[PDB]
Amino acid sequence: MPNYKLTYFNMRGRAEIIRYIFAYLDIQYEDHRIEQADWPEIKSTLPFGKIPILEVDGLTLHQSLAIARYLTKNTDLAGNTEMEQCHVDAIVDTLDDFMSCFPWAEKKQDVKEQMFNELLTYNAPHLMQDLDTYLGGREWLIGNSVTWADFYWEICSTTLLVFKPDLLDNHPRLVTLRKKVQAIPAVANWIKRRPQTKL
Amino acid sequence: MPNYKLTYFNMRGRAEIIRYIFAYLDIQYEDHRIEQADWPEIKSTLPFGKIPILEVDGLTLHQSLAIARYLTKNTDLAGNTEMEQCHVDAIVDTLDDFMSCFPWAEKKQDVKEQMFNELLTYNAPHLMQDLDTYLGGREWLIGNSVTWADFYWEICSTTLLVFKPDLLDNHPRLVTLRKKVQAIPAVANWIKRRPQTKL
Numbered sequence: 001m002p003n004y005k006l007t008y009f010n011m012r013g014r015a016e017i018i019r020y021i022f023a024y025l026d027i028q029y030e031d032h033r034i035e036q037a038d039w040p041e042i043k044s045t046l047p048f049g050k051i052p053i054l055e056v057d058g059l060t061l062h063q064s065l066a067i068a069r070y071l072t073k074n075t076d077l078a079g080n081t082e083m084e085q086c087h088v089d090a091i092v093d094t095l096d097d098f099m100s101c102f103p104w105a106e107k108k109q110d111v112k113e114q115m116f117n118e119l120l121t122y123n124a125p126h127l128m129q130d131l132d133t134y135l136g137g138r139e140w141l142i143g144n145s146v147t148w149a150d151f152y153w154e155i156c157s158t159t160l161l162v163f164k165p166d167l168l169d170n171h172p173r174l175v176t177l178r179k180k181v182q183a184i185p186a187v188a189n190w191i192k193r194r195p196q197t198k199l
Numbered sequence: 200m201p202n203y204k205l206t207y208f209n210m211r212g213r214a215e216i217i218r219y220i221f222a223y224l225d226i227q228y229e230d231h232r233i234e235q236a237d238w239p240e241i242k243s244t245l246p247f248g249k250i251p252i253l254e255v256d257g258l259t260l261h262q263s264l265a266i267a268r269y270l271t272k273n274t275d276l277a278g279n280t281e282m283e284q285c286h287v288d289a290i291v292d293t294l295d296d297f298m299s300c301f302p303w304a305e306k307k308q309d310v311k312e313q314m315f316n317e318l319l320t321y322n323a324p325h326l327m328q329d330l331d332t333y334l335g336g337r338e339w340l341i342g343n344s345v346t347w348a349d350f351y352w353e354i355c356s357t358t359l360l361v362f363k364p365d366l367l368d369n370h371p372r373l374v375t376l377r378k379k380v381q382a383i384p385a386v387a388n389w390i391k392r393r394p395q396t397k398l
């Protein structure tokens with residue numbers, strides 16, 4: 001076992017996927033959370049100035065989805081074939097493109113209201129129908145067992161539900177997915193233990 | 200042999216990385232390019248509404264980065280160690296994030312200009328510096344041989360230079376990586392044979 005040190009804001013954000021993988025695989029790591037006041041002092045230290053980073057034996061990794069992929073390679077969470085690993089990556093990227101559309105950094109809180117409302121009213125419902133069709137009559141998004149794509153669905157939807165809490169009212173299959181992930185004893189164990197933040 | 204059929208616009212866009220990968224590996228495939236007129240109909244066909252897609256022997260893949268990662272999985276484009284493949288993904292995600300910031304589909308013209316300018320004036324230089332720094336004196340972005348991250352760097356920068364020609368004027372080391380990538384024989388042939396599109 002190597003030693004690990006995760007560094008991110010005190011929020012779920014883009015680090016939650018990594019904490020989910022860590023928890024599912026039973027990997028003791030350090031979850032180092034910073035205040036946004038300590039962000040300028042640390043940004044210059046970072047390779048490309050963005051967070052999260054994972055340190056494994058003095059080696060800094062960046063980019064959440066690349067770290068997530070790195071930590072699940074050769075694990076059940078990855079998918080069983082290159083095609084299945086491709087589908088995991090397509091779903092993750094698709095969810096991620098939509099999570100990234102939101103103007104989290106927009107300082108004008110008025111303008112951040114508008115874009116958020118539009119994406120949650122026009123964009124998101126279409127996407128929730130694409131997932132539903134894609135999932136079909138499977139329990140999990142890819143194959144016949146959990147992958148970190150499912151983890152990612154749960155993480156993304158948790159944060160989309162905070163804003164539009166009725167987002168899945170016409171999609172109980174996507175709610176059951178959320179519950180199947182929250183049912184994984186290691187994941188459930190961490191969902192209760194984790195710090196309670198909005199995002 | 201397996202059969203491949205790729206569909207995207209008649210432009211480099213987010214399909215070009217796949218095309219580069221097919222060249223390097225000497226893989227025969229159909230480069231299907233759709234007219235911008237046939238786009239509204241084809242969306243209904245597409246899984247999550249985005250292109251490119253890659254049909255493979257009667258299976259459809261989406262998400263250009265997930266597709267590229269599939270085609271490079273067992274090849275030398277993918278990286279020499281498990282840590283280095285993480286780094287390959289991380290550089291590509293760092294570059295895709297920056298390409299994705301741009302409002303390629305913005306319907307309002309005035310919005311499109313203000314953001315492009317903004318990103319080329321302040322953001323792009325910061326990223327150029329950070330990449331240059333990451334590259335150091337080495338030959339390829341990652342490890343000691345070419346990866347598809349190096350392909351991605353050439354593809355992104357080709358599109359960026361169209362809007363900012365003085366982009367790399369202070370980073371000859373990154374220009375050298377372009378030229379090195381462009382001189383790989385399988386790639387050099389493709390740049391010359393591909394359709395000359397703006398983006």
Ligand SMILES: CC(C)(O)[C@H]1CC[C@H](NC(=O)c2cnc3cc(N4CCC4)ncc3c2)CC1
Pocket residue numbers: 009011012013014036039096099100104105155156159199
């Ligand atoms: C300029 C500042 C103050 O330094 C920063 C501004 C942006 C802010 N970022 C967010 O508040 C935020 C929260 N949650 C997210 C969740 C996701 N999802 C994809 C999987 C979950 N993506 C992106 C997310 C961004 C951090 C502080």
Ligand SMILES: CC(C)(O)[C@H]1CC[C@H](NC(=O)c2cnc3cc(N4CCC4)ncc3c2)CC1
Pocket residue numbers: 211212213235238295298299303304354355358398
């Ligand atoms: C009018 C339509 C039909 O609605 C479309 C709107 C979107 C628009 N998109 C682009 O023109 C475009 C071009 N080049 C790109 C390059 C990259 N890069 C990552 C590696 C290079 N990414 C994204 C890119 C998007 C096409 C027309």
Ligand SMILES: N[C@@H](CCC(=O)N[C@@H](CS)C(=O)NCC(=O)O)C(=O)O
Pocket residue numbers: 013014049050051052062063064065105296
């Ligand atoms: N998207 C990459 C980079 C993450 C990123 O951009 N993080 C933000 C906060 S979540 C940051 O470090 N600075 C603010 C910003 O990028 O707008 C990842 O998943 O790791």
